Amino acid sequence: REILVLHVGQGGNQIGYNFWKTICEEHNIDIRSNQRKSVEEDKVDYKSVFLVEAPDGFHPRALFIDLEPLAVEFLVKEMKLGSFFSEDLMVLSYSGAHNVWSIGYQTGKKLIPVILEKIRDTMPETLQGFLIIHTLGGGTGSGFGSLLTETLKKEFPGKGVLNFSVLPSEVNDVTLAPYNTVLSLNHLSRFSDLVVLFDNTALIRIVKDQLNYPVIKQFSDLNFLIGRVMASITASLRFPGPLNMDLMEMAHNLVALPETKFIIPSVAPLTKEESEMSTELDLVERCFDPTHYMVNCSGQGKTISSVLMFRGNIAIENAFSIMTDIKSNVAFAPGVHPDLGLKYGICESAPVDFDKEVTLLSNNTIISEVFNRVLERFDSLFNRDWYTSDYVNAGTSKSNLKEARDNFDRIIKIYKEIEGSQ
C-alpha cells in the first residue's frame, strides 16, 4: 500500500510543505525532528504508506523536483525542515521553464534518468502508486509534471498514477496559463488514472470567507486545504477503519467513462469551531456546496460519481442513514441510478484539526464549464497567434496546440453528454 509522492515546480513543492506537515501530525511526528512525538499511535498506524523509517529520522517517500532551485531553497530554509526534506530527495536544475509548458516538458527529460533511479531505490515492490503534485499554469509543474505523468505510467504499468493539479485563478495570474493548462490536461487525460483539480480562485475565497483567517502572505494556508484533501483520502490506508479503500479503488469508483477522470474535491468542516456544530449530514451537504468546492463552480452540478471519506466522530448508523438524504439533496446526472453514485470510506482516525471530517471527491459535469472557460481563454490567444512564438520556438507547434485543444474539447463534450441526456 506504499505510495511515492512527486512535487514538481514551485507550487507543487510549496504544497508539499503543508501536506507532509499534516501527514507528520496525523502520525504523531513533528515534521522537523523526523522523530516521533509519541509512540502512542505508532501501533494503530501504518506509517509506511508515506513515511520511510530510519534511526536518524523519518523520511518522506517523496521526490522534490524543480527546474529552478529558489522555490525549494527558500521554503526549506524559512520553514527549515532540513532533516525531513532530505536533499537526497531533491532533483534540481537551474534553467527554469519561464512559464512555457514545452520548455519544462523537455528540460525535464534530462533529469528523468536520475528521478527514475531515485524512484527504483525508494520504492518497495509493494508500492501501489504515485501522487504527482503540480500546478498547471506555470511551466515546470505543467510541462515536467506532464512528462512525469507520462513517464511513470509507462515505466510502471499496473501501478496507479494520481494527479493533484492546481488550476489558475479565474482571472489568470499567468497569461500563458491557458496554453499550459490545455497542454497539461491533454497529457493527463491520457496517462493519469485520476486528476483531482484545484483552482486558486475557489481556494482564495474559502480562505478569505470560510476560514476568515487574519491575513495571508504565503500560499501556505491555501495549500493546507490541498494537503487536507490528500491526507484524508489516504487516511483509511494509514489508520484503522471499518471500510478502507486504496488509490485504484477510488479511481475505479469515480471514472465512469475512460475520459471522465477529472475530479472536484471538498472538505468539511474547514474550521474546528464548526466541527462541534455539525452532524454527519450537515458536513455532507456543505461538501456538496459551491462554498466548499475547491474549484470555482456555479452550483452543485450533476454528480456522476462521488467518494466520501468519513473521519473521526462519524456515526456509521447515520453515515448510512443519510444516503437517502444525500441523493435527496444532491442532483446527479440524468443517467445515474438513484441507488448508485456513492463510494464510502470510513476511517476512525480524526483529522489533525477537527472533531469530525467528511472529504468529498466528486466526478461532476460542472467541470465541463470550468474547462470551457479555459478553452475560451486558449482560443482568444491561439486565434490571434499571441504568445505562440515561444511555444513554437520551444518545439510545440500550433499543430500540436490544436491537437491538444480539440482533445481537450472532446472531454468537455463527453461531460456535457452525461449532463444533458438529449
Ligand X SMILES: Nc1nc2c(ncn2[C@@H]2O[C@H](COP(=O)(O)OP(=O)(O)OP(=O)(O)O)[C@@H](O)[C@H]2O)c(=O)[nH]1
Q: Which residues bind Na ion (CB under 5 A)?
A: 10
- Which of 7, 11, 227, 231 is in the footprint of ligand X by CB under 6 A? 11
CA angle 279, 281, 287 (to 5 degrees): 105
Query: Min. distance of Cβ 348 from ligand X in angstroms?
Result: 30
Q: Which long-range contacts (CB under 8 A, 24 or more apart) does 396-404 make?
A: 396/101, 396/102, 396/183, 401/179, 401/182, 401/183, 403/186, 404/182, 404/183, 404/186
Contact status: 265 vs ligand X (CB under 6 A): no
Contact status: 301 vs ligand X (CB under 6 A): no
Contact status: 295 vs ligand X (CB under 6 A): no
Contact status: 9 vs ligand X (CB under 6 A): yes
H or E stretch at 148 = helix 145-155
Q: Which is nearer to Na ion, 92 or 123 (CB)?
A: 92
H-type alpha helices, 239-351: 247-254, 272-275, 280-287, 316-321, 323-329
Write the interaction track for ligand X spanning residues 53-92; mark x where CB under 6 A is met and - where it is not.
--------------xx------------------------
Q: Which is nearer to ligand X, 137 or 341 (CB)?
A: 137
Q: Which is nearer to Na ion, 103 or 336 (CB)?
A: 103
Torsion of CA 10, 13, 17, 20, to 10 degrees: 160
Which one of the spans 4-12, 314-322, 370-378, 380-388 is the region binding ligand X (CB under 6 A)? 4-12
Contact status: 99 vs ligand X (CB under 6 A): yes
Say how many residues make up the chain: 422
Query: Min. distance of Cβ 176 from ligand X in angstroms?
Result: 9
| CA separation for the pair 57, 54 (Å, rounded) | 5
Q: Which is nearer to ligand X, 174 or 264 (CB)?
A: 174
Q: Which is nearer to ligand X, 177 or 319 (CB)?
A: 177
Contact status: 160 vs ligand X (CB under 6 A): no
| CA separation for the pair 80, 188 (Å, rounded) | 33
- Which of 3, 10, 275, 396 is in the footprint of ligand X by CB under 6 A? 10
Which residue in this structure is represented by grid cell 513543492? 13
Contact status: 357 vs ligand X (CB under 6 A): no
Grid cell at residue 354: 477537527
Mapped onto helix, strand or coil, the DSSP state of residue 411 is: helix
- Which of 16, 137, 241, 341 is in the footprint of ligand X by CB under 6 A? 137
Radius of gyration of the chain (CA): 20
Mapped onto helix, strand or coil, the DSSP state of residue 123 is: coil
Binding site for ligand X (CB under 6 A): 9-11, 14-15, 67-68, 96-99, 135, 137-141, 166, 168, 173-174, 177, 200, 203, 219, 222-223
